[PDB]
């Protein structure tokens, strides 16, 4: 019933930044977390007298249920890369050296030789299926010199991903802490919203 954004795990849905839902795969996301904010209503919407219109994420528009170049998870919402592959929005935000082509639409994603050289270089300490602990790219805990490594989506599941507020003026506002260094209150509500996101999509 409650709508949760699968990128930031926030639950606020206002008229300016609405949490929307893909009508084929079911994922739910803030307009602003996916680059579809402030866009005009579709041409198909003139046919309806209803207040809502169908919407489809980019993977479904292309008829794929892709895998991510940067992690082993199959859930969540994706953006296409310049090479025709796919990455999670969340992985693109948190992995260093990965940037969005234009910030307004968050499209496309350009992955470099430097990104690919990090493949498998660290073992993800949170993978539940060790067969994948060395796929993709890990980030590390951002507390001091802590060298704890994990996939962005594995860290998301444990409620470890944080975003600084805009007023804080931190050039890279996306950061993560391992469980040893995390804010316990923040982990709690993020884990709670993650578990509700899993029950709603299924």
């Amino acid at each position: 019933h409650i709508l949760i954004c699968c990128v930031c795990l926030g639950d606020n849905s206002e008229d300016a930044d609405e949490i929307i839902q893909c009508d084929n795969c079911g994922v739910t996301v803030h307009e602003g977390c996916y680059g579809v904010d402030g866009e005009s209503d579709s041409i198909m919407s003139s046919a309806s007298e209803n207040s809502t219109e169908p919407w489809f994420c980019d993977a479904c528009k292309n008829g794929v249920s892709p895998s991510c170049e940067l992690c082993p998870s199959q859930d969540g919402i994706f953006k296409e890369t310049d090479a025709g592959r796919w990455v999670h929005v969340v992985c693109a935000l948190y992995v260093p050296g990965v940037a969005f082509g234009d910030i307004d639409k968050l499209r496309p994603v350009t992955l470099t030789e430097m990104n690919y050289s990090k493949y498998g270089a660290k073992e993800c300490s949170l993978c539940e299926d060790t067969r994948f602990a060395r796929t993709g790219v890990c980030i590390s805990c951002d507390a001091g010199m802590c060298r704890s490594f994990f996939h962005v989506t594995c860290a998301q599941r444990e409620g470890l991903l944080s975003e600084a507020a805009a007023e804080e003026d931190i050039a890279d506002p996306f950061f993560a802490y391992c469980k040893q260094h995390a804010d316990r209150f923040d982990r709690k509500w993020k884990r709670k919203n993650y578990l509700a996101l899993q029950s709603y999509c299924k």
Partner: peptide
């Protein structure tokens, strides 16, 4: 789905 902006205040 996505609420049309005509239906947003």
């Amino acid at each position: 789905a996505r609420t049309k902006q005509t239906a947003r205040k």
